[PDB]
Ligand binder design. Structure first.
Ligand SMILES: Nc1nc(SCC(=O)NCCN2CCCCC2)nc2sc3c(c12)CCC3
Ligand SMILES: Nc1nc(SCC(=O)NCCN2CCCCC2)nc2sc3c(c12)CCC3
Ligand SMILES: Nc1nc(SCC(=O)NCCN2CCCCC2)nc2sc3c(c12)CCC3
Ligand SMILES: Nc1nc(SCC(=O)NCCN2CCCCC2)nc2sc3c(c12)CCC3
Ligand code: NA
Ligand code: NA
Ligand code: NA
Ligand code: NA
Lengths: 396, 396, 396, 396
C-alpha cells in the first residue's frame, strides 16, 4: 500500500475503479476531455503490492468570488477507495498528499462537489453554495403586470438546436461566469462534452432544446419517464430582461404540466408570477464545497460590502494561523499576529462564509464560529455578504 | 347582497359556511376561544335577501418587528365566499370594508396566512416570512465536536406531559416572541386551545410529548400513519444552548427514523451535525403575509441595521403615498414629499421587505421594485435586513 | 442517577416513559393485567436527582422446550431509556441488575421480544424462534386430493364471536402450549386482554371473528385500510385435521382476495394446496430471544433426538463456564470440567441453538460456534434439532 | 395434431413460439449455446396440419445430490403451448413422450424450474430447493467480533472485470458444484453466455463487476432503475473464509444503500453481522423441481445421515412401485417387495425429500406422506436430511 502519481499504464485500472465507484460514469472516451484539466502531478493512486485500490486528483479551475475576482482553484474529483480496502486510511493519505501539492503549487483555494455531506468537513471543506430545485406547475403560471416583456411587440427569444449555436452559448456563459460568485471558466472540451449530451440517446435521455436570447440561454429536455415534466439543465442570464424572456418562453411549453430547474435560493422566478407559490422548492442541497488553502491570500483576494464601515479584529483558524483582519472600503488586509483572538473557527467554516452563502450569525448560533462580541458578528455578517447572489456553475 | 357587521344570530350561518369552506375547522366550541380576539366591528358578513354567503374578520394581534418593537396588527381570518356566490365581487367588497375599519382604527399593519398564494397580492399583502420543513434521518445524526452540550455532566432537558408545565411553556414563549421578528403574543385562550390538541384523539392524532429546558421547549407527536416519523409541532428556544439541548433529546428518540419540523431558513440545526445534509429541506412555503396600512408609521416604528451609514431617498408606494425616507443610526424618518421618486413599488412589495425575509435586490431583479441607482438598492438591502432571523409564530 | 425497585408512586412516571418510548402502548388500564405477572423485585427504575429516566422489568413466564418440558422463564419487557439520557450506560446498569436478580431467583433462562435486532446479542440473548408471514391469494387456492377433510360429510368448524367461546379457546391453547417448543402459559388476565382487542374500536381495528374446531381455533379480522385482506392474528391447532379444517374455512372467505398469518417456517399450509407457491412468504423476522442463565440446568432440562447415538464433548461458553457434555437416549448430563474445550461459543449462540430453530452447522459457518471436529458438529446439529417444530406463543 | 421430433426446419417456428411464450427470451443466437445441451431425440414439437403449436425438450445435466454423488439429470425446458391451442391436452401428450424417452435413456431423475407452481405436481415433479432473497441495508451493517477476516493484515479479495478472470471463476464454480447438493455442471457455452450478460447493454442492464478471492467470487451489478441497490447475481464460496471476505467487500460498496442476493435458507450472512435483522428475507420461492424417474436407482445413489442407526421399511410410491427400503451407514438398499407398505407418497413428494430441503414430518402433517409409525417418520426425517445445505446452481 504505497502512494504514487499514476503513469499511462495506471489509467485503465483507475477507469475500472471509476466504473465500480461512480454510477453516473460515462466512460474512458469522455474522460479524455476532463483529463486535459488535470495538471502533471495532479493525480495520486494507491496500488496493492498490481491493481489500483485508491485514487484522487484535482483539476485546474478558475472560480469567480465576490468583487468579480477570479481565483486559481484546485477542483478535487475522481476520489475513490476500492470496496476491498475501506477503513484502511487510504483517503486520509491521498487527501494529505494532494493538499500538500495544491498548497505548494500556490492555489489559494480547493473546491469539490460532495458525494456525501459527512466526509469532507474534517479535510477542511465547508459547503459554500446552495442548490435549489424549483418546479413550476406552468398551467396556472401568469406573469405579473410588473414583469419585463409584457408588451407583445415581438419575442426576442428563439427555439434552436444547441449544436448550431455553440458560439453564442459560450459567449453568454463567459459573460455570466465573470460577473457571478461561484462562476467557473468552462474550457472548450467541456462545451464539446455538454453539446454531445444534448443529442438523444437510444433508450436514454431525449433530445435537448435551447431557448436563445442575446443576453441569456436555457437548455431543457423532456424527462425520460415523466413526459409532462421539462427539466431545465442550464439557464444562464446576464440581464433581468433575458431571465424574464427565457421564463416566458418556458411557461409557453403548453405540452408540459411542470418545468423543473436546479437554481440558487435568490432566483427571482417566483417574483415574476402573480402567485409566488406556483414555483415550489422541491429539493435543497449543498452545491460547491471550498477549502481555503491560504487564509491571508483568500481573505485579501475577495471584495467586501462597501456598506459596513472600517473595522479590525483578530481571526484564529484552528491549525490554520492567527491573523489581524482589517476590512474597509470593500478591501481586506490580513497579516500575522500573536495578539488575542476575537474570532475562532475551524477551516471548513471559513470555506462556508467565503462566497457569502451562509451568515456568520447562523454558524455562530451552532457554535461553529466563536466570538464574545455580537457587534463584531454583525460586522463580519455584513462584510462577507455578496451583493450578487452566489450561484453554482457546473458539477465536476 | 348587502354588507353588515354580524349579530349573534348570524354566527350559526357563519360556522356553516366555515365547515363548508375550511377542511381543518375544529368547530364552534374552539371558535369561542378565537372569537375573544375579534373586536366589536371586527367582522363583516354578506346575506342574500336569509343565509350567510360571505364573511371576513380581523383579530387584535401584537407582532414583533426588527428592533424588538411590538406593533398592533389586524390579523385577517375566517374569510369565505359561498360556492353558490363566486365571481360576484363579494371578497373585494368585504376586504375593502375591513381595510377601511382597520386603517380608521389606527392599525399600522394587517397580517394573514394565505390559503392560496395567488389571491392576496392585489389587496396589498406581500409574503413576509418563509416556512422551511427540515426532516432529519436521526439514525445517522451525530453532533459536531463544536456543538454545545457535548460533556455528559447531566441533561438539563426533561420529558414531560404538556398540560402539567403550561406555566413554563407560556413564560418561554413570552420571552421568545418579544425578541424575534414575526413573534406574536399568544393570549390565554390559545394556550387553552393548544394544550387540548396536545391530548390523544380517538382514531385521530396521538398523544403530544414535551421536551422542557429552562430556556426552551419542543412539543412533538408521532405521525398518525407513519409510526417511524416524529413531528415537532413547536420548538421555542431563547438561547443557543437550549436549541442544541432540545435537538440532542429529539435525536435520542431511538424508536423513530425521522424527525420533521416546520422552522425558518436560518435554523442552525444543520450546523449542529457532522453531516449538514442529514437535515433535508422537504418543503418551503410563504408563512405570514403583511399589508402595510400606514407607510410612514410602519417604516418609522421598526429598527434598521446600524452597519449601513446614514442615507436619504424618496419612496413612492403605488396608490400609497410618496415619502422622503431618511435612515441612519438604525432609525427612519418618513415624511410627505412631492419631490421626484427614486424608488417605486406596489404596497405588497413593501410588506415583503418589512420583516427582512426578502432582499430588495431580489424584488428589483423581478422589477417588483424600480430604481435607477444600484447604490441605493444595496443600501435599502442592508438597512431592511434583520440581525435576528425572521420566524413564524403560529397560524391564524 | 441511582438504580432502585419502583414504589407505587414511580408507576405514573414509568407509564409516561412508556407512552413516549413505545408507539403500540395501550395505556395504564391494560398495564394492570401485565403488572400481575411482574414479581416483587421484578422491576428497576433510574430516577434523575425526580422523574423516571430508565426502567426494565421481567415477568414470571412458563416456556415449553423440546421434550415437552416447561421451564420457569424471566420474560424481560418494558425496557426504556429516556431520550434525554441516551449513551449514559443506563441500559447496561439496569440489565446487569435484573440478570443478577433473575439468576439469584433460580430462573434457568430469560426471554424477550427484540424492538431492534442489534441490542440484545451483547447481553447474551440469541434469536431462538423465527416469525414467517404467509399471504395466500385465496382466489386461486385449491386443496390437494391428499389434504384431510375432502369429503363433504359436514364441516366440523363453526364461525363464532370470540367472547362467547373463551372457555374453548383457553382449553385448546393450554393443550397446544404444553406440546410445542416456544409454547407459553397464557394466564387469565392476558385472555381478558386478548378478548377485549377482539371487539371493534371506533376508527381503529374492525370486529374479530373466530373459526372454532374441537381441536383448533383461528382468530381473524379484516385489515383497517385493505378491505380485501383478512389478518389471522392467531391459529392454534393440536391435530393436523384441525389445521386443514381451519384453513378450508379461511380459504372460504369469498369476500377476501388475501389471507395473511404470522406463523413458523414449518407451517404445512403450503403443502395443503395444489400450488405451494400461492402461500408466499411476505416477511421473516426473529421471534423470541433466549438468554441461558444457568448452562448446566438448561442443557439438562430439555430432551434431545433419540436418533443420534450417545456422545461426549466439552462445551466452553465464553465467560459462562466449561462443561463435560454427555448426550444419549434423548437426555444430557452437564458437569464442571477444566479439560480442554472441543466447542466454544458466546452465551447468545447457545440461546439460538436451545429450541432447535438454528443449526450448529449454520452458526459454525459464521464462526459464532468454534470446533475442530466436523463429526461433533453433525452430532450437535442432530441432537439439538426438535422433532416438533418451534413456534412463537405471543409477544410480551 | 401429431407429435414428432423437430427437424432443423422446425426451429424457426419453435423460436417464434418461444418469443411469444417467454418474456425473458434473449433470441436464436443465445439459443445456439443451450441447443448443444439438447441430445438427439431430446425435443418434441406439435404441428397443426404447418406451424409449431407445442414444444418441449430436455437437456443433459449433471446434478450433485447428498454424499457428493453426481447423477445424470434430464433438465426439462422450452415447454410451450400456443395460446391458440390451450385446453387440448398438448402438454400432457408432450410430457408423456419426453418422460418415456428420459426413462428409456436411463436418467434416474428429471429436473425443471417452474414458470408457475400449480402445473408440475401432477407430472410427478416436487419442489426440491428453496430460493431466499436477502436484502442488506449495508449502511448499518457491522461485522461481528467472531467473523473471520477481522484483522486488517490485507484484503485477499480483488475487484475485477468478469471477462479477464473466466478461468478462475470456472475453477471455483467446478469445486463448488461438486461439493454442494443442487450443484450443476456449467459447460463452456453457458460460461460464454454468462460473461456476455456481464457487459453493459444500451438502455438495458449496467456493467457487472466481480469480487475475486482464491476460494470464492461474487458477480454484481447496480440495478437499472434503483441506483442505490446492488444485485449480487452469483456468489460461489468453497470456504467460510471466502464467504466472509466476499461479504466484507460487498458491505464496502459505500455508494449503495442496499445489497440483494438470491441465496438459500441456510446462508450464514445474517450470523456474520452484529444485527442478524439487517439481512431481511424479501422473497422466497421454490427453486429446482425433481421428478424421480427410477425410485430404486435414485434412493440407492444418494448418501444418508450417519447419525441415524440402521432401519428398514416398505415405501410405496403411488403408481411408482413398492420397495423394501433399508438405510444404514449412510447407504440405502431399495428392492422390489409385495409386503405391506409402511410409507405411502405420490412421486412428487419423493422429489421434494430427495435433496433434504423439506422434512418428511412437514409433508406428513399435510398428509402428502402417510405412515402409522411416528418413530419411522423421525428416522426418515433424519436419514434424508443433508449435512451440506441444498443450494440452487442456475436457472435453465
Ligand atoms: N471530474 C469529472 N467529471 C465527470 S462528469 C460527472 C460530474 O460532473 N459530477 C460527478 C462526478 N463524479 C461522477 C463521474 C466522474 C467522477 C466523479 N467525468 C469525469 S471523467 C474524469 C474526471 C471527470 C476527472 C478526470 C477523469
Ligand atoms: N383564526 C382562527 N383559527 C382557527 S384554527 C386553524 C388555523 O390556525 N389556521 C387555518 C385557518 N383557517 C382554518 C380554520 C379556521 C378558519 C381559517 N380557528 C378559528 S375559529 C374562528 C377563528 C379561527 C377566527 C374567529 C372564529
Ligand atoms: N409486556 C407488556 N406487553 C404489553 S402489549 C405489547 C406487546 O405485546 N409487545 C410489545 C411490547 N412493547 C410494547 C408495549 C408494551 C411495552 C413493550 N403491554 C404491557 S403493559 C406492561 C407490560 C406490557 C409489562 C408490565 C407493564
Ligand atoms: N433452457 C434455456 N434457457 C435459456 S435462458 C432463461 C433461463 O435461464 N430460465 C428461464 C427459461 N425460460 C425462459 C427463456 C428460455 C425458455 C424458458 N435460454 C434458452 S434458449 C434454448 C433453451 C434455453 C433450451 C434449448 C433452446
Ligand atoms: Na482588534
Ligand atoms: Na434624496
Ligand atoms: Na470428550
Ligand atoms: Na419392515
Amino acid at each position: 500500500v504505497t502512494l504514487c502519481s499514476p503513469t499511462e499504464d495506471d489509467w485503465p485500472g483507475m477507469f475500472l475503479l471509476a466504473a465500480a465507484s461512480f454510477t453516473d460514469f460515462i466512460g474512458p472516451e469522455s474522460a479524455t476531455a476532463w483529463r486535459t484539466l488535470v495538471p502533471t502531478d495532479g493525480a495520486v493512486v494507491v496500488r496493492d503490492g498490481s491493481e489500483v485500490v485508491g485514487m484522487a486528483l484535482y483539476m485546474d479551475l478558475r472560480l469567480t468570488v465576490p468583487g468579480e475576482v477570479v481565483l486559481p482553484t484546485a477542483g478535487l474529483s475522481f476520489v475513490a477507495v476500492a470496496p476491498t480496502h475501506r477503513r484502511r486510511g487510504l483517503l486520509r493519505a491521498m487527501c494529505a498528499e494532494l493538499h500538500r501539492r495544491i498548497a505548494d503549487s500556490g492555489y489559494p483555494v480547493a473546491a469539490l462537489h460532495a458525494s456525501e455531506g459527512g466526509i469532507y468537513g474534517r479535510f477542511g471543506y465547508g459547503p459554500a453554495t446552495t442548490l435549489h430545485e424549483l418546479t413550476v406547475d406552468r398551467r396556472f403560471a401568469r406573469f405579473h403586470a410588473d414583469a419585463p416583456g409584457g408588451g407583445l411587440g415581438g419575442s426576442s427569444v428563439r427555439l434552436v438546436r444547441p449544436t448550431e449555436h455553440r458560439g453564442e452559448f459560450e459567449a453568454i456563459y463567459e459573460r455570466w461566469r465573470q460577473q457571478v460568485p461561484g462562476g467557473l471558466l468552462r474550457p472548450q472540451v467541456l462545451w464539446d462534452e455538454l453539446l454531445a449530451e444534448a443529442k438523444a440517446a437510444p433508450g436514454g435521455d431525449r433530445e435537448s432544446f435551447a431557448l436563445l436570447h442575446p443576453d441569456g440561454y436555457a437548455l431543457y429536455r423532456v424527462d425520460r419517464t415523466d413526459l409532462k415534466l421539462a427539466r431545465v439543465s442550464e439557464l444562464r442570464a446576464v440581464t433581468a430582461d433575458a431571465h424574464c424572456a427565457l421564463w416566458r418562453a418556458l411557461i409557453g411549453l403548453d405540452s408540459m404540466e411542470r418545468i423543473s430547474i436546479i437554481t440558487h435560493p435568490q432566483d427571482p422566478l417566483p417574483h415574476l408570477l402573480t402567485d409566488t407559490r406556483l414555483a415550489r422548492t422541491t429539493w435543497r442541497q449543498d452545491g460547491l464545497w471550498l477549502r481555503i488553502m491560504n487564509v491571508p491570500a483568500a481573505l485579501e483576494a475577495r471584495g467586501y460590502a462597501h456598506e459596513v464601515g472600517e473595522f479590525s479584529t483578530v481571526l484564529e483558524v484552528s491549525d490554520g494561523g492567527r491573523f489581524a483582519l482589517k476590512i474597509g472600503d470593500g478591501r481586506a488586509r490580513c497579516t500575522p499576529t500573536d495578539a488575542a483572538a476575537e474570532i475562532e473557527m475551524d477551516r471548513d467554516v471559513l470555506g462556508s462564509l467565503y462566497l457569502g452563502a451562509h451568515r456568520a450569525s447562523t454558524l455562530a448560533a451552532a457554535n461553529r464560529l466563536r466570538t464574545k462580541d455580537s457587534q463584531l458578528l454583525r460586522r463580519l455578517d455584513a462584510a462577507f455578504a455578496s451583493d450578487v447572489p452566489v450561484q453554482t456553475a457546473f458539477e465536476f
